[PDB]
Amino acid sequence: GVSAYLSRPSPFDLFIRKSPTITCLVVDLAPSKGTVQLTWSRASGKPVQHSTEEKQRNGTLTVTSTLPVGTRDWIEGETYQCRVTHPHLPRALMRSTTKTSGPRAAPEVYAFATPEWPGSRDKRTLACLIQNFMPEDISVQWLHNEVQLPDARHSTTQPRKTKGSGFFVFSRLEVTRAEWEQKDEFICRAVHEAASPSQTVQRAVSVNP
Amino acid sequence: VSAYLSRPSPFDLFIRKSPTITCLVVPSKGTVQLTWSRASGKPVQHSTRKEEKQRNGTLTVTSTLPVGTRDWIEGETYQCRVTHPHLPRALMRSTTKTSGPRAAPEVYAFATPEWPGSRDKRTLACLIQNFMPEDISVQWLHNEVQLPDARHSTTQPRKTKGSGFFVFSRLEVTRAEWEQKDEFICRAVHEAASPSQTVQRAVSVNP
Amino acid sequence: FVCNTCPEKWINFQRKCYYFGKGTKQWVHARYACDDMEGQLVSIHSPEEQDFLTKHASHTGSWIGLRNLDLKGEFIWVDGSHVDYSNWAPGEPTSRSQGEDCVMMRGSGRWNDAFCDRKLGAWVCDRLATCTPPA
Amino acid sequence: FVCNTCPEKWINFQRKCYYFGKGTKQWVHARYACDDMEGQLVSIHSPEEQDFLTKHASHTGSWIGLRNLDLKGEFIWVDGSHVDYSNWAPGEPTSRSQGEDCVMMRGSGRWNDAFCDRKLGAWVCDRLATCTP
Ligand SMILES: [Ca+2]
Ligand SMILES: [Ca+2]
Numbered sequence: 001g002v003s004a005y006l007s008r009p010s011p012f013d014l015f016i017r018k019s020p021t022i023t024c025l026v027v028d029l030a031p032s033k034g035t036v037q038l039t040w041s042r043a044s045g046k047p048v049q050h051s052t053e054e055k056q057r058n059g060t061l062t063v064t065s066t067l068p069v070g071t072r073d074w075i076e077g078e079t080y081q082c083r084v085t086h087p088h089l090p091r092a093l094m095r096s097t098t099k100t101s102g103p104r105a106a107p108e109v110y111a112f113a114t115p116e117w118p119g120s121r122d123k124r125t126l127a128c129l130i131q132n133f134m135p136e137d138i139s140v141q142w143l144h145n146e147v148q149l150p151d152a153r154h155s156t157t158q159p160r161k162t163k164g165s166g167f168f169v170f171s172r173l174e175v176t177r178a179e180w181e182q183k184d185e186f187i188c189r190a191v192h193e194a195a196s197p198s199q200t201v202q203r204a205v206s207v208n209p
Numbered sequence: 210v211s212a213y214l215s216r217p218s219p220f221d222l223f224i225r226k227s228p229t230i231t232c233l234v235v236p237s238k239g240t241v242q243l244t245w246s247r248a249s250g251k252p253v254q255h256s257t258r259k260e261e262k263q264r265n266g267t268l269t270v271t272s273t274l275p276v277g278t279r280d281w282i283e284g285e286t287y288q289c290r291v292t293h294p295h296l297p298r299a300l301m302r303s304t305t306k307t308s309g310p311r312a313a314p315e316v317y318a319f320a321t322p323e324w325p326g327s328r329d330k331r332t333l334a335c336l337i338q339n340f341m342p343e344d345i346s347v348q349w350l351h352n353e354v355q356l357p358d359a360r361h362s363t364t365q366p367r368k369t370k371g372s373g374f375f376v377f378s379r380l381e382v383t384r385a386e387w388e389q390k391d392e393f394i395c396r397a398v399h400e401a402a403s404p405s406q407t408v409q410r411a412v413s414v415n416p
Numbered sequence: 417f418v419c420n421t422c423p424e425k426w427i428n429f430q431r432k433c434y435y436f437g438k439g440t441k442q443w444v445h446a447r448y449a450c451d452d453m454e455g456q457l458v459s460i461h462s463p464e465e466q467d468f469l470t471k472h473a474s475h476t477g478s479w480i481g482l483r484n485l486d487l488k489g490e491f492i493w494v495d496g497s498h499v500d501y502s503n504w505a506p507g508e509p510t511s512r513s514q515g516e517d518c519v520m521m522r523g524s525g526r527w528n529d530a531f532c533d534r535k536l537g538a539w540v541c542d543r544l545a546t547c548t549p550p551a
Numbered sequence: 552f553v554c555n556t557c558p559e560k561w562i563n564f565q566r567k568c569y570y571f572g573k574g575t576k577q578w579v580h581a582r583y584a585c586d587d588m589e590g591q592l593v594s595i596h597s598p599e600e601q602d603f604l605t606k607h608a609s610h611t612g613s614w615i616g617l618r619n620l621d622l623k624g625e626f627i628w629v630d631g632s633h634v635d636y637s638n639w640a641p642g643e644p645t646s647r648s649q650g651e652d653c654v655m656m657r658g659s660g661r662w663n664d665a666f667c668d669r670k671l672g673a674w675v676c677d678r679l680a681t682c683t684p
Contacts, residue, residue: 015487044448075486076444077518077532101533104513108324114317114336127336129321129379155375157364163381170377172336174370194513199487223622249583282621283579283653284667308668311648401648403624 002029006082006095009069011191012139015199021052021068022097024082031061037085038065042078043096074099100135104194105166107133111188111205122177124207128188132166135193140171143187143202144179180207211235214289214302217281220346220398223406229275230304232289236268241293243272248286248303281306307342311401312373314340318395318412320382329384331414335395338375342400347378350394350409351386387414419547428545429468434458435541436472443518443532446479446539447494455543457481459493461501470525474538480527481542482519491519503527554682563680564603569593570676571607578653578667581614581674582629590678592616594628596636604675605660614674615662617654626654638662 004027009020024038040048053063069080077099084093110129130140136159142149154173162168171188180186186205195201213235217228232243239260245253253274260270276287286305293299314337321332337347343366349356363378378395387393396409422433437449450456458481460466481494489512491499505526510516516529520536530536557568572584585591593616595601616629624647626634640661645651651664655671665671 044445046448072485073444076447076483077442078444098533101531102513102515104515108321110319110321110334112319112334114315117315125336125338127317127319127334127377129319129332129334131332131379155367155369157367157377160362160364162379168379170334170336170364170379172338172369172375172377193486196489249580251583279620280579283582283618284577285579305668308666309650311650400621406622 002086002089003027004082004084004093004095006080006097008097008100008137009074010139011137011193011199012141014071014074015191015193018071019068020071020074021066022080023064023066024084024095025062025064026084026093028061028063031059032088034087036063036087038063039083039085040065040067041081041083043081043098044078048080077101100137103134103165105132105134106194106196107131107138107190107192107201109188109190109201109203111186111203113205113207124175124180126173126175126186126188126205126207128171128173128203128205129168130171130188130190130201131168132162132164133190133192133194134165134167136167137193138167138169139189139191140169141189141191142171142173143189145183148189149173175207184209210293210296210300212289212291212300212302214287214304216304216307216344217276218346218398219344219400219406220348222278222281223398223400226278227275228278228281229273230287231271231273232302233269233271234291234300236266237295239268241270242291243270244290244292245272245274246288246290248288248305253287284308307344310341310372312339312341313401313403314338314345314397314399314408316395316397316408316410318393318410320393320412320414331382331387333380333382333393333395333412333414335378335380335410335412336375337378337395337397337408338369339371339373340375340397340399340401341373343374344400345374345376346398347376348396348398349378349380350396351392352390356380382414391416417547417550419545421546421548426543427472429465430462431545432465433543433545434469434472436474436478437539437541438474438537440535440537441479441539442535443479443483443520446536447481449539450481450541453541453543455541456494458540458542459495459497460503461497463501463503466501466503466525469521469540473521473523473525473540475523476537477523478521479536479539480519480521481540482527483517483532486517552682552684554680556681556683561678562607564600566680567600568678568680569604569607570678571609571613572674572676573609573672575670575672576614576674577670578614578618578655581671582616584674585616585676588676588678590676592629593675593677594630594632595638596632598636598638601636601638601660604656608656608658608660608675609673610658611672612658613656614671615654615656616675616677617662618652618667621652 005025014020051065051067079098082095108131112127114125140156156171157169159167189202213233215231222228256272256274289302291300317336319334347363361380364376366374391413402408419431420428422428426433482491505528508528511529518532520530554566555563557563561568640663644664646664653667655665
């Protein structure tokens with residue numbers, strides 16, 4: 001038994017950084033003493049750019065190829081394919097990816113902060129709820145001192161469907177007293193296709209203002 | 210063919226005092242056989258089978274076994290065995306109480322600001338965090354009555370920066386609910402929550 | 417100095433050359449085709465330009481060089497130029513989404529927004545025609 | 552009356568019989584064992600009762616009939632009685648979690664809370680001694 005994955009670029013990389021990449025991730029549920037051959041191909045037959053393996057903490061090999069794509073190329077509807085030459089499945093793997101074509105909706109941003117819990121005076125947890133957007137592709141970021149907090153620092157759920165047509169995520173961010181006793185304002189950013197202008201919706205959030 | 214086995218809901222266990230576990234297996238000649246057995250070798254109660262066809266030509270069949278309250282808490286290991294014509298070597302799933310450190314959940318509950326073009330509806334949010342183990346039951350309340358499970362949606366427990374876990378729950382609400390009685394309770398049943406295995410936060414739409 | 421020289425298989429009109437390609441192509445695949453033919457998808461700017469194309473336009477429908485950077489919400493020709501001339505069919509653009517960040521031309525010469533992954537049997541390229549020194 | 556009669560392989564003390572089982576078992580598997588033997592996990596109530604047991608306790612350690620309903624936080628003997636006599640080893644119960652909702656007895660006769668999924672090599676059962684008329 002064995003699966004593989006191919007992930008669209010990050011709204012951030014695409015719309016803002018303007019250098020989107022897709023990644024083909026293959027999870028091997030038991031690695032054999034051979035190589036894996038991740039091959040890239042465009043549905044047009046145009047040349048793919050040059051693309052960019054790890055032992056997991058349970059003896060499973062996880063190898064990921066990061067192919068950088070064209071900004072315009074992607075947005076216009078180019079289909080990208082991942083062909084993985086595996087030594088254990090009778091034939092190959094054909095994972096394929098393209099721009100999700102249908103309705104738009106701009107995301108709703110909400111940022112809160114947790115009330116004080118006794119014995120944790122030095123830290124608080126800020127929540128952000130980003131909802132009613134579509135398609136599911138969205139990038140979520142936290143800001144301070146008008147520089148962006150690194151990715152590890154917070155944790156954002158996989159987009160789930162809402163009761164209606166939208167999608168929603170929550171982002172959770174623990175902050176030290178040092179941080180909010182410098183500038184007591186933290187911005188929750190969401191880069192989404194439908195968000196205008198400049199593909200951005202953001203809320204600002206204060207620990208007891 | 211994968212196979213799965215889920216612990217009871219802390220609500221069934223701690224409050225309802227009638228916990229159930231479920232063996233979920235995600236298809237041809239359906240001679241499927243879900244077998245139940247205790248690690249002690251003691252007799253298991255009678256379980257509830259139901260098979261269902263999914264909206265992609267996959268069969269999803271689940272067996273729900275009811276367990277002893279005390280027996281579960283005290284550490285009994287329950288097992289699920291499956292034998293089948295389209296299966297090579299029988300799948301054997303086991304479940305037991307997660308034996309580890311405990312931490313009671315921190316509950317916080319919000320109602321979302323008014324959105325332009327959406328007057329008669331709001332969205333309530335509930336963050337339950339820093340608890341362990343991950344097993345946790347989330348519920349929403351209104352006028353003595355517990356809101357139906359479909360009404361809200363709660364995340365799979367993710368690890369926190371520290372040692373605990375966190376879940377979020379999301380709840381869309383009508384004007385007639387809150388104008389009637391503008392109080393909505395977010396309730397957590399968790400193992401470590403004292404007293405009587407409950408933590409809850411009340412939240413109002415513009416209090 | 418007069419401009420009407422076209423390379424073979426290109427039909428001229430005023431100071432541009434026009435190629436009317438055929439084959440099931442998506443919009444972006446329609447885009448590629450014209451680059452490889454050293455032109456670009458068509459950019460319609462004059463009602464006269466539209467008249468000329470309407471008479472050569474496939475009745476199945478054609479792909480034209482109109483879409484948006486998304487980071488816009490506004491349509492723009494593949495040459496970079498904005499929309500001065502428009503030939504919108506009734507009800508169209510249904511855009512704001514929908515969808516349909518790509519503009520297609522019906523048999524009637526009328527424009528309508530259809531999805532980009534949608535496949536059409538024809539597309540129209542253009543390029544600048546080349547000219548001839550005076551004597 | 553006089554009560555000191557025990558069914559075979561059971562050791563007597565005061566008005567009760569005690570079985571010192573041996574075998575790798577979890578706490579609840581150790582509880583089962585005692586049921587099958589028509590007794591229950593041991594419930595210690597007097598310093599003399601503990602002193603008796605200390606002499607027969609395996610070095611490896613032993614399972615005793617003390618735990619909680621969780622819907623407590625407070626330990627209770629499998630016979631239903633609360634804790635009147637206690638023989639906690641120092642810094643124990645480490646409970647309040649941790650976890651360790653089950654109590655074991657050391658070689659020393661001292662008690663310590665250990666996790667219930669842990670497997671120990673001995674357990675002690677008890678039952679009421681029978682009497683000679
Ligand atoms: Ca349309
Ligand atoms: Ca201890």
